[PDB]
Amino acid sequence: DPGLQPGQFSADEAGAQLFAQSYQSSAEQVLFQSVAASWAHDTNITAENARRQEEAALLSQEFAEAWGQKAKELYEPIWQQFTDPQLRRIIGAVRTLGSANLPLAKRQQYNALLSQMSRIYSTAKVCLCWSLDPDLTNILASSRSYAMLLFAWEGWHNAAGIPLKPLYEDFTALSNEAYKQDGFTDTGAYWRSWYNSPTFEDDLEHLYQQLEPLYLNLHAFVRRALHRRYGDRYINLRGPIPAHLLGDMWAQSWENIYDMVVPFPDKPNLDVTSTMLQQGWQATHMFRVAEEFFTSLELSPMPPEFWEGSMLEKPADGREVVCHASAWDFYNRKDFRIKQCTRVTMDQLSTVHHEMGHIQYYLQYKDLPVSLRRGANPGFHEAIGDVLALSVSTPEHLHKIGLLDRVTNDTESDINYLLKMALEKIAFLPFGYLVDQWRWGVFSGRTPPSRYNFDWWYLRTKYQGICPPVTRNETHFDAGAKFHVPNVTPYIRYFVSFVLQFQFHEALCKEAGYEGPLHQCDIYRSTKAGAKLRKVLRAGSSRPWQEVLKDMVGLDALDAQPLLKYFQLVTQWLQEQNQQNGEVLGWPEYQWHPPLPDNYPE
Amino acid sequence: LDPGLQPGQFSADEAGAQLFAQSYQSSAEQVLFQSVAASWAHDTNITAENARRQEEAALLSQEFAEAWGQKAKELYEPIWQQFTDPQLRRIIGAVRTLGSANLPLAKRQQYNALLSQMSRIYSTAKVCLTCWSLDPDLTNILASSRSYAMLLFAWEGWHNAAGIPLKPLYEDFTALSNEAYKQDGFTDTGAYWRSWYNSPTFEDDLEHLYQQLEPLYLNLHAFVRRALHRRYGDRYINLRGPIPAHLLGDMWAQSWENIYDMVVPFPDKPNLDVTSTMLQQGWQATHMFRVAEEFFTSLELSPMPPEFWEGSMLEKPADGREVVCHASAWDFYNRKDFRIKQCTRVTMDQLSTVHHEMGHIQYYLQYKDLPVSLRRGANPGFHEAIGDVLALSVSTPEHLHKIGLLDRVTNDTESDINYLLKMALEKIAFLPFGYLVDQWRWGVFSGRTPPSRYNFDWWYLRTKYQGICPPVTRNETHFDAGAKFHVPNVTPYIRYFVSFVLQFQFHEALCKEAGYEGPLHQCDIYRSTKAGAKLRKVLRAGSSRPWQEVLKDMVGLDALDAQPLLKYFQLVTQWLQEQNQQNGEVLGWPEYQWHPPLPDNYPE
Numbered sequence A: 001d002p003g004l005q006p007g008q009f010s011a012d013e014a015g016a017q018l019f020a021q022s023y024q025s026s027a028e029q030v031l032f033q034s035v036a037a038s039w040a041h042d043t044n045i046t047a048e049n050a051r052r053q054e055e056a057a058l059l060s061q062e063f064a065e066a067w068g069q070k071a072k073e074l075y076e077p078i079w080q081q082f083t084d085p086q087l088r089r090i091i092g093a094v095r096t097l098g099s100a101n102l103p104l105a106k107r108q109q110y111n112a113l114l115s116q117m118s119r120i121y122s123t124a125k126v127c128l129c130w131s132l133d134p135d136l137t138n139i140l141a142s143s144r145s146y147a148m149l150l151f152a153w154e155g156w157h158n159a160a161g162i163p164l165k166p167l168y169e170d171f172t173a174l175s176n177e178a179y180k181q182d183g184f185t186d187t188g189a190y191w192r193s194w195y196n197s198p199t200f201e202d203d204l205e206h207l208y209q210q211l212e213p214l215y216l217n218l219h220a221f222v223r224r225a226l227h228r229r230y231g232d233r234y235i236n237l238r239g240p241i242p243a244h245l246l247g248d249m250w251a252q253s254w255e256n257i258y259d260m261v262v263p264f265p266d267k268p269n270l271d272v273t274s275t276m277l278q279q280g281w282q283a284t285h286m287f288r289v290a291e292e293f294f295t296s297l298e299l300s301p302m303p304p305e306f307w308e309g310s311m312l313e314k315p316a317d318g319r320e321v322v323c324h325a326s327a328w329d330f331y332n333r334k335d336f337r338i339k340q341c342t343r344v345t346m347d348q349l350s351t352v353h354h355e356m357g358h359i360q361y362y363l364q365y366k367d368l369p370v371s372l373r374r375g376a377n378p379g380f381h382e383a384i385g386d387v388l389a390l391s392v393s394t395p396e397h398l399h400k401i402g403l404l405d406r407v408t409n410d411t412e413s414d415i416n417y418l419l420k421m422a423l424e425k426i427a428f429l430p431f432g433y434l435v436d437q438w439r440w441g442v443f444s445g446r447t448p449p450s451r452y453n454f455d456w457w458y459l460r461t462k463y464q465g466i467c468p469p470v471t472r473n474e475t476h477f478d479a480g481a482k483f484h485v486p487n488v489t490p491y492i493r494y495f496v497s498f499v500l501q502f503q504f505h506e507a508l509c510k511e512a513g514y515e516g517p518l519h520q521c522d523i524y525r526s527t528k529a530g531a532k533l534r535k536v537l538r539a540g541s542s543r544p545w546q547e548v549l550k551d552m553v554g555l556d557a558l559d560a561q562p563l564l565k566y567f568q569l570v571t572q573w574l575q576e577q578n579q580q581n582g583e584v585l586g587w588p589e590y591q592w593h594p595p596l597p598d599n600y601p602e
Numbered sequence B: 001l002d003p004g005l006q007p008g009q010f011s012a013d014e015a016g017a018q019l020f021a022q023s024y025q026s027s028a029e030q031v032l033f034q035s036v037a038a039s040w041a042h043d044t045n046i047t048a049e050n051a052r053r054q055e056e057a058a059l060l061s062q063e064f065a066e067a068w069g070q071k072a073k074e075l076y077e078p079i080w081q082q083f084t085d086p087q088l089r090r091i092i093g094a095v096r097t098l099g100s101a102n103l104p105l106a107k108r109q110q111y112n113a114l115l116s117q118m119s120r121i122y123s124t125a126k127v128c129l130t131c132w133s134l135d136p137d138l139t140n141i142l143a144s145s146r147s148y149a150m151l152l153f154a155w156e157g158w159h160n161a162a163g164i165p166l167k168p169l170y171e172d173f174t175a176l177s178n179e180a181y182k183q184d185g186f187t188d189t190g191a192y193w194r195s196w197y198n199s200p201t202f203e204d205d206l207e208h209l210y211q212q213l214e215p216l217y218l219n220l221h222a223f224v225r226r227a228l229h230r231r232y233g234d235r236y237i238n239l240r241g242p243i244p245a246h247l248l249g250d251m252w253a254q255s256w257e258n259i260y261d262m263v264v265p266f267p268d269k270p271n272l273d274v275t276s277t278m279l280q281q282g283w284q285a286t287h288m289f290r291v292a293e294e295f296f297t298s299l300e301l302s303p304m305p306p307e308f309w310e311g312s313m314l315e316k317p318a319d320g321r322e323v324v325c326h327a328s329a330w331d332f333y334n335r336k337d338f339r340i341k342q343c344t345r346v347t348m349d350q351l352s353t354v355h356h357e358m359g360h361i362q363y364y365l366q367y368k369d370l371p372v373s374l375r376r377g378a379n380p381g382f383h384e385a386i387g388d389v390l391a392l393s394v395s396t397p398e399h400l401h402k403i404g405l406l407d408r409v410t411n412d413t414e415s416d417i418n419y420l421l422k423m424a425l426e427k428i429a430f431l432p433f434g435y436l437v438d439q440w441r442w443g444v445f446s447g448r449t450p451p452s453r454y455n456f457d458w459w460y461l462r463t464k465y466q467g468i469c470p471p472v473t474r475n476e477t478h479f480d481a482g483a484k485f486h487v488p489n490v491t492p493y494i495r496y497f498v499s500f501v502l503q504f505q506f507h508e509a510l511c512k513e514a515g516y517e518g519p520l521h522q523c524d525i526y527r528s529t530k531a532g533a534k535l536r537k538v539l540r541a542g543s544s545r546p547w548q549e550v551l552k553d554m555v556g557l558d559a560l561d562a563q564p565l566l567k568y569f570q571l572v573t574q575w576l577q578e579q580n581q582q583n584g585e586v587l588g589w590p591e592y593q594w595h596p597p598l599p600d601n602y603p604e
């Protein structure tokens, strides 16, 4: 389109001021038509929807090509030297073309692999048919039968991973070609550029080192409990934990096995799932309850377009959907939606808050020039709803919303709560860190196709201390059985969030005027904490996240002390328990795999 | 420190520096000698009393290094980098690096004790059940047994006996070493070891080299795996998995020359492993070293001096004494004493080792007149390549014929494949191992591999690069890296990777200088005084000039380059790829998790 193709403009700071306004003008329309078509497909997976999606992806590249080439022409000389930092941010972004740098037939091919990988992931079933969500999800969460958990884990990893591998290798090659033309050594380097930090990798590594003792202690304590349940045949007290026994397909959060490891067991059940079902909660209640938390802070309610247009339950009409929960900004300032195959569980209630966190962000920055309508970094975007969920999950808040009868504020209830929170937050950390370590090595060429599974399991064992419960080889592509890999969504943002949410939480609880233990704070109804959060959300990516962070929390860097201080009591406790059972921290028997159950699979 | 050994005063300028280096050189050689001598006494006669003496000599060295080091600092800390004299900058640059001399005395004593105990553990470890030593007993088993159970016994016995007791010492050594070098301004000890190559893209340069060589290795591996499967069967060899690490002829699987007889593609052609002929003919250690020497003199390089023949240890002592058997060359730094210590056995590969060690001696003879600080190879890989280049000529069929080791001469395509395959078992099979060892140790020095992952990371790398797997389960009580000499002995490894590449660049250049005009793999530089003069210019330089410029003068290129090695191997590279295809092989080891079962009723 002519009216989409760029204007003239002079080569100078002024000219560039007009240029950017012209850019963000036509981009609104283009982003709209992409986001719109992926939506049609994600909630209705067909050949046709795929075709449409590809058409839109092409139009985007054409736009990006035209506008990036123009910004090179005009500004490539002089843009790093404009006094205005907000402009410098916008122009640098504009001149990064991405898959737009590809010639046309490769542009095609890349758009198509995304579509087949997405389809394979979200339509894969396990047969003797069970889908990932809800069937395999519920099995992994609540079955305590070694053999059934095994059959779900293997069936899933085989059904999703095997067929994806050939496509993923093609995808990597195209993505790398594309980004090399913007001056990036490879795609991973581009993804990392989003944090604008020279010492990014080193910083993450220093963070992980302070967090590792917490995970090691939690792991040994949980390993001990799984040994009690499953015996020496299947659990090695000095070896990795079999990857299917931790309550989740990816072993990435362990809250579903809380009932097996709860430290003082007879006390009130801090998992309120059975009460939610007892009371008849539905998807709609969960969303309204999340919203009211938002509005209690004087943040924005969800608009009519959100309720009218979102998909809050898996459709009952035999229609393939991408189940994985997600939040959608259509770049209209009007349409914002969530697509979630919502189940009635306490962990889904948290997911609903996580997703609505994204929507709130999008409502707070909708009056920005498109290119500023991102989080200050991707980690910020992932942390917003998680922050509110930390207040929601407190026993006192649960009591306020009628899901729990008031607990006694004693040291045992503290420990039980902190341990549940550790199963969700600390257990996640190694997996949050390792996923993009795998994918950065793939994009760099350090991990060729001939080592995709070898390097995956190296990292899984290294960081999470888990092992595959059945033999794997390079026909298997176990990384491809996690959503974000075929769906090309970066992962390091979740490790950043998991640390960042504790920094935000402590800053918020301070603005709230709260004065007790960090892990007992509820910011519900604090207009002041709301005010501070609002300033973060409206800023989008106009400013450096380092400065956004300082204004918010008083420090200019990611920091583990808030998280450490939140969990201090359970950290101290777990250390004591492991000693008394004389545990080995870590998994020195690193070659150990469990045997197969007798005559598997029958 | 003895008064005559201590630094005086020198002005704070380049003219003071020169007098300083000259005064240092006078005292350094006495201090180097006492230290080398004490190491010799210990290594040829391992006793508590000898280790005590070596420890005291190492402390004296440290006192010397610290006094001359801190003086070199005090007077020249900035200005040394701006010296007009390049050799003087290199000398000062070395003197000002203190290493272990940076530790306070208590820690220096701890470090020196650790080195001594780690050396003693490795060089006195035995496998029991009447005791087998590594050399010759376990070496011979790995080389000639074809009994899966026997090889396993030797492999496991060794790794358990040497590795397990070393692990606590290695951990403490790593920490002290890093603490020492970090006061020289290095992030860790591996950064200091890498600085010897004076190349900011060193790690990337090596990775790029490795990428070009990897296909040759994968094809050699697959072909050998097939040969082992036909002998050991489907239970112990997985045609799509890593090879068990005790079946390749060598304790470390680091070179595969010993399974030549099982892989030779054309058995009707002359037998190129002449070990049996050396035995039939009655060769001893002394003949081996004299034949090596005569190659050097044929090139008009120097003979071994009388002090070499009078002082060297050329067989394992019969008199009942513990010795360090691993072969080594020794410069005493007095310009007079130069020695080899080798438990020589009468085999073709030992004849190659004789040449390797004599190449070291020849370098020390040619540079003996330089300042002590420049008595080193242009980089460490240069010192490792000298003897190997000559051994390339020696191993040729035509050369073996001239020295009475191979009666039949043939020049046809099948004999050439046999020869190039035998050379690939020696040279191409080593590459992955030569590359991986310091990747392991650089990770340990940088803290990426903590003690809790020493064996996990070691086997990750052994599988990744070599495509082998341990034949019994290992865990973190094992310390398999410690079962290789250079780990406990603290000798860096990347130099052998460098030298396996560089020796083909040197070979190509000396062949050309020799006037030789046929296939590169049939060249013998024997009796070429032109080739000798070109080599002599390298040897005479020591570390006085940047290795990149020495290389360029020699070979006409200023970088390591895989092209000469590819050219040498081209006929067998192509043959192995065609054979593996016809046989339907899988290149690589996609069943990465596979390990062989135990023999029924092992080890009874």
Ligand SMILES: *[C@@H]1O[C@H](CO[C@@H]2O[C@@H](C)[C@@H](O)[C@@H](O)[C@@H]2O)[C@@H](O[C@@H]2O[C@H](CO)[C@@H](O[C@@H]3O[C@H](CO)[C@@H](O)[C@H](O)[C@@H]3O)[C@H](O)[C@H]2NC(C)=O)[C@H](O)[C@H]1NC(C)=O
Binding pocket: B398, B411, B517, B518, B519, B522
């Ligand atoms: C073993 O045999 C090879 C092959 O020899 C050649 O091909 C055979 C099939 C027969 O036809 C032989 O008669 C024929 O020579 C020998 O390699 C060859 O060596 C010759 C002699 O040095 C090489 O010729 C030289 O080539 C250069 C140019 O590169 C000229 O400047 C010279 O004047 C001269 O002609 C010939 O290139 C070379 N062939 C190959 C494939 O490199 C080989 O020397 C012989 N080896 C032994 C140990 O005897």
Ligand SMILES: C[C@H](N[C@H](C(=O)O)[C@@H]1CCCN1C(=O)[C@@H](N)CCC(=O)O)C(=O)N1CCC[C@H]1C(=O)O
Binding pocket: A324, A325, A326, A327, A328, A351, A354, A355, A358, A374, A375, A381, A382, A484, A489, A494
């Ligand atoms: C269910 C949660 N879902 C993701 C998500 O919401 O992050 C979804 C799918 C991938 C991206 N996403 C979005 O919604 C994007 N709109 C967010 C980025 C943006 O808006 O700019 C999740 O994956 N999670 C939750 C935490 C752990 C992680 C996981 O489940 O692996």
Ligand SMILES: C[C@H](N[C@H](C(=O)O)[C@@H]1CCCN1C(=O)[C@@H](N)CCC(=O)O)C(=O)N1CCC[C@H]1C(=O)O
Binding pocket: B254, B326, B327, B328, B329, B330, B331, B353, B356, B357, B360, B376, B377, B383, B384, B486, B491, B496
């Ligand atoms: C047997 C050969 N042995 C070494 C050797 O000679 O390199 C000996 C022991 C370690 C260092 N060394 C020396 O003699 C040094 N004095 C030489 C360096 C110098 O003087 O500047 C070796 O290990 N090798 C040979 C190639 C493969 C390697 C190995 O066997 O693992």
Ligand SMILES: *[C@@H]1O[C@H](CO)[C@@H](O[C@@H]2O[C@H](CO)[C@@H](O)[C@H](O)[C@H]2NC(C)=O)[C@H](O)[C@H]1NC(C)=O
Binding pocket: A396, A409, A515, A516, A517, A520
């Ligand atoms: C639960 O008990 C703890 C006592 O251990 C309370 O913590 C104290 O709370 C007061 C009031 O805010 C503060 O002044 C103290 O500094 C707190 N002490 C410590 C050591 O943390 C906590 O507030 C109680 N709250 C609930 C939820 O009942």
Ligand SMILES: *[C@@H]1O[C@H](CO[C@@H]2O[C@@H](C)[C@@H](O)[C@@H](O)[C@@H]2O)[C@@H](O)[C@H](O)[C@H]1NC(C)=O
Binding pocket: A470, A471, A472, A473, A474, A475, B240, B590, B591
């Ligand atoms: C890879 O694995 C596939 C699945 O088979 C299972 O794993 C093998 C390794 C056995 O140990 C057993 O657990 C199962 O049969 C195999 O079909 C396939 O052949 C393996 N090899 C390759 C190269 O893909």
Ligand SMILES: *[C@@H]1O[C@H](CO)[C@@H](O)[C@H](O)[C@H]1NC(C)=O
Binding pocket: B045, B047, B048, B049, B050
């Ligand atoms: C070995 O060393 C001891 C002292 O530790 C010495 O008395 C003995 O003579 C030495 N043996 C030989 C043969 O050098």
Ligand SMILES: *[C@@H]1O[C@H](CO)[C@@H](O)[C@H](O)[C@H]1NC(C)=O
Binding pocket: A238, A588, A589, B474, B475, B476, B477, B478
């Ligand atoms: C490692 O293996 C050995 C024997 O194979 C065994 O004794 C030991 O218990 C295992 N070590 C550890 C730390 O578990």
Ligand SMILES: [Cl-]
Binding pocket: A191, A194, A378, A379, A490, A491, A492, A493
């Ligand atoms: Cl990210």
Ligand SMILES: [Cl-]
Binding pocket: B193, B196, B380, B381, B492, B493, B494, B495
């Ligand atoms: Cl080296």
Ligand SMILES: [Zn+2]
Binding pocket: A354, A355, A358, A381, A382
């Ligand atoms: Zn999210």
Ligand SMILES: [Zn+2]
Binding pocket: B356, B357, B360, B383, B384
């Ligand atoms: Zn050597």
